[PDB]
Symmetry: D4
Subunit: 205 residues, 8 copies
């Protein structure tokens, strides 16, 4: 499987003149103010991925950020709440056109409580995601082949999952519900950055 | 001054305004089991309308016209609940809302008490009495204590909204609040559809 | 408030030629195999009560038991699950025509989670129940006046509560639901005596 | 080897169900009957075969199935019938009133364990292995997978044999009348769930 | 291993003219008032065991009970708290000279929190206890071979465990503490039968 | 209310030629290895009390310890588990003839879950214990009158409570149960000093 | 006597002393979100200085001089919080500190209540009112009750420190407390860096 | 190579070094009840010394020389435990330490698994077997499995310390870690004195 590794940014957008792009991130942890963005992964859905190493202190990634800003391109995430927060914190741009397979799973796979990407890929695609490298030093100057393959696996299948989840949202008549959740998701990520990451803002208490 | 009505407002003469305070009373917290019993409205002029909703009542045209009017902001405290029961009962989901509980959670960061009683006490030195919160709101005739509790829940929302808007401006959270209000009707729909116990945005 | 105190049993049922009788018990504790029946309270709903002291090791109370066995007389309890268990354990007869105000409250007072008799009496009747004597030596040879008044207070209002709860069950169309619950309640008390007192027999786990 | 007959909508007729007791199970889109539709109803006569009935979205009628559900001369055997009774009554409007539940029976007889699931019971009582891999699957799919069909059938193929053993244990420990009263209330317990008390033990002190 | 299976009682005490006997029980569950005694197991420590089926409603087992009341014979249990209760409840004799390997483990195996018999046998003896039949129908008229072997495995090793725990109690100077725990253990079992099974009688709350 | 305050020890035993002495302690906290014994309180039951301030580092108290050692004098405590541990840890003598009103309450006041001394004195004697000074500096050179009264209140009523609990133990036929619990209590206190203060040594886990 | 100042002390004339009592008020418990609003100081003479901190204020030279002065002990109650917000706001972490809450946890072993209100009541028979703890500390004008609460938090720390020092000596824990106070600034830094929810010394 | 000794190292010939890896085995987690049974050392050269400590042993002169030598850093994994039992047993608290568990918590922010086994697996692809962790460490003769487990706990600490030092430098947390290591002996002392269940820095 072809995985193109880059330093800093995509060299150009020639592989991303598309309606929808799969996006994922790797970091030194779950706390965007402490744990820096280390990797950004992209896939056009053609079975290949781009794995972009983000340097410490890196302030710009113009080609990546152009995609994230392009309202004509849907950014597909799994649990985009996290990715949106670290991407916006790092480069100062919050995408506003998104699809999230974890929210989609919670709205459609009502017959299970397991909504992780590994579980979804196994059930919907018979694809095995290995999570061995999930907790690894993503800030390493040189990523191992296993790290690169894990990072790519998080974006290689999101188009196919989105297709299936769109079928399920239509079947159960929840398209407008999913759309409103996706519309709010960038602000949910902003709330996390602003200090409400532990607070369900809609809860009674 | 509290105007008590059966079924619906007699007319909209008191609600040619920019924003209306809205609250509801029910037989409990479960909209599929616990019917809407009372709808309270206030213009902010210190008067309230308390509308008794009958069992099985399917319509209330004057109330619903207000709820439908995109030029009128519906102010709630914890509108998540009121939006659900109103939409479930009359079939219309308001889409222009302000919620003082979300606003409190976004501004009163110096406390963990965001109930309406606590907010009214701190911001207005107004005393809300919760004694009738748990009462038979389906009664044919509401007690004087019930009518006054129901009215107290809308009499102050305009004044609270003004203060919270100052706080949202001061701490630069106006667009955060606006996106939360924009999603609140769909959050209420999610509750009606079966996700009332689920934070749809949580990782697990 | 007339409260007639008896040793062992009523002398006759002349005050109980009625369609429903309010019943409550006091004991040495919540565990019927360890904590003996000490007091049985009755009221016809006329604002008077009978308080019957049960002796240690007492095996029969024929007038009381005739009432408990009479299928033409509904026995009204608050939380009859407990009273039914201790009554059947002590005298060998399980009443099978019952009404429970706590079950009725849970089926109708859906706007609260407080279903205690004190709470219900306050809300429905504006009647104040003092629970100071609830935890006291109910096995004492002579009950104090405060004990006797607490014991009587537990039965003096059950008819009035049943009337209101019957109105609410009709209004919310739950009469057949309530009837089924009352029909099962004696066997729920039996399940407690047999060893399932800590088990919700209908739960998935 | 196990004959599994798959149907769309309803049984074609009741020729296989002129019997005193029928094993019943359901598959759905989830645990919430107001949100999660009935997708499959499974039946067995106890002869080692099973009928697996796909229920369409929006389907309001299943006349032959519902005939059995309403026939008071036929005991409907479930495992954890509390759930099945709720979604069946919610979908077709008929609550069965003559039932036997192997989970309740297990709680009243297998006092030497805390594991009352169907897989555990089949393993202990029959040395039969139940595989739960398809329990969480898309039961609304237009075509069920072979694995799905076999899971669905496995939930009804053994209930008669389990009922027989549990009746033996209920007699031995003298709990027949207790079990009977539990089964008599179970339909109303399922109704309480539909009406809004699914999270409430109605008999609890608090 | 030789496992002698008996109905009702030992035929005689020819194998039990010894200073200490290993004892275990099987039942229909953990609640002695509901769940009858089904099996009593004994071993003299010679690698053989006796497995005694107790009939429903059986009131007498004179040879077994002679041993239980013989103050010259220490009764060894693993978690005797349970066995003492069901034995005393069934036959009316509470042993008063006992040793418990679970209490002993809690007083000596301070380097672990796993005090079950299976864990103890693996560590101290490299003996594998299979727990598959622990939850089984112990009231069956004919016990399976696997049930018989499980029941015997619970007594075949208690002498060997006791010898080791005695060495450890001496080594850490806790012999008098263990002795006082064993002296109280029959009353702890009695407390369970009387209604305090869920109460640590010595706790502050 | 006559309360005699002493430094170090009783001046003599003239007020303690009796069959039972009420005993309580005050400390710098709940951990006997960290928090030193500060006060020992005694009462003969005559409505007076002795309050003995114990100095930091004090290793003996001959008159007090004579009483603690005297097999012919029952030491009455409320929750003696604590007092026994700190007394034995400080002066090296573990009393072995004891009565504990908290254990007695748990064996008799089965109609409540409130077994503190304040609640017991309220119910059984209509005596009000004020707990304001329970958390105070018991190591202070000069105790306040409020502290002295709190300390004395803990021993002034134990004789009267013991009398009532002995009546209840006899009534419910639990005398031998209580006696066995009191007999183990000194070893329960030793178990705490040795490192099992957080462990119910009789629990299955 | 309570002196209210804008931005900073006018001078250090009242603080030519060995130890100063310090407290802070904020918009909440999260230093990256909730700005510093008030800094309170007392010399121990029964008077207090209440300093209102402006939104976006970056410097307070006289206050920061005190905070940086290695010759002056800064006395806090639960300084873990005050150290974090003061350092995050003005860039200077005090490194000579005494904390009465740590002191209380090391000496008041006979209770589990270590709040400032409980300590003042027990040790001084002084009643601290908490009514204004949760209030809008960012208000342009502080109420008298707010000012008195702020001042009450520093007016007694000298007297409490004196008592706690006697207890630390009596129970022979002086070097334990010193080591705790020595690490406290770094514990506050760990909070600012993202470990505020983590006991860094715990096994798990 | 694993060298097993009774009582003490025979000499310090193998420990004329800048840092020594140290671990302990005991009869349990409570130092006042559960005696020190084994002390393990390694110089980092791939060999280890395993010292059986006798019941009631008060002296280990060569070992204790290392522990009090301020020119030698003592490397631990979760030294909070080892420091407590060593100081309780021999009366000397080391004052120059490095802890791989604290270092992991400060650097391996991408996981919540900070045990030695997980650390060795990720950082070194070294498999630590925990089978003997709960065993009778007071046995007169340790099994080979026990000896290998005990040695494994020190054979890799130098290599881990080097990697953690790289991570601390990369993320600029060196002074944070130093302060944590400085307080760690006092944290172990707090455990011995009776605060083992208390986070002394917590609000409650």
């Amino acid at each position: 499987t072809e995985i193109r590794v880059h330093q800093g940014d995509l060299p150009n957008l020639d592989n991303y003149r598309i309606d929808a792009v799969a996006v994922d991130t790797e970091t030194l942890g779950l706390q965007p103010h402490r744990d820096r963005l280390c990797v950004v992964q992209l896939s056009s859905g053609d079975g290949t991925a781009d794995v972009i190493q983000i340097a410490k202190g890196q302030k710009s990634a113009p080609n990546l950020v152009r995609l994230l800003s392009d309202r004509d391109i849907t950014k597909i995430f799994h649990f985009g709440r996290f990715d949106l927060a670290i991407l916006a914190h790092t480069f100062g741009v919050m995408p506003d056109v998104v699809f999230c397979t974890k929210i989609a799973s919670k709205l459609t796979r009502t017959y299970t409580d397991r909504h992780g990407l590994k579980e979804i890929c196994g059930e919907l695609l018979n694809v095995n995601i290995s999570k061995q490298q999930q907790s690894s030093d993503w800030a390493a100057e040189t990523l191992s082949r296993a790290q690169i393959e894990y990072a790519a696996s998080d974006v290689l299948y999101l188009h196919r999952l989105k297709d299936i989840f769109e079928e399920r949202l239509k079947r159960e008549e929840r398209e407008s519900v999913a759309k409103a959740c996706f519309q709010f998701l960038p602000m949910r990520a902003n709330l996390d950055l602003l200090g409400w990451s532990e607070i369900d803002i809609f809860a009674h208490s």
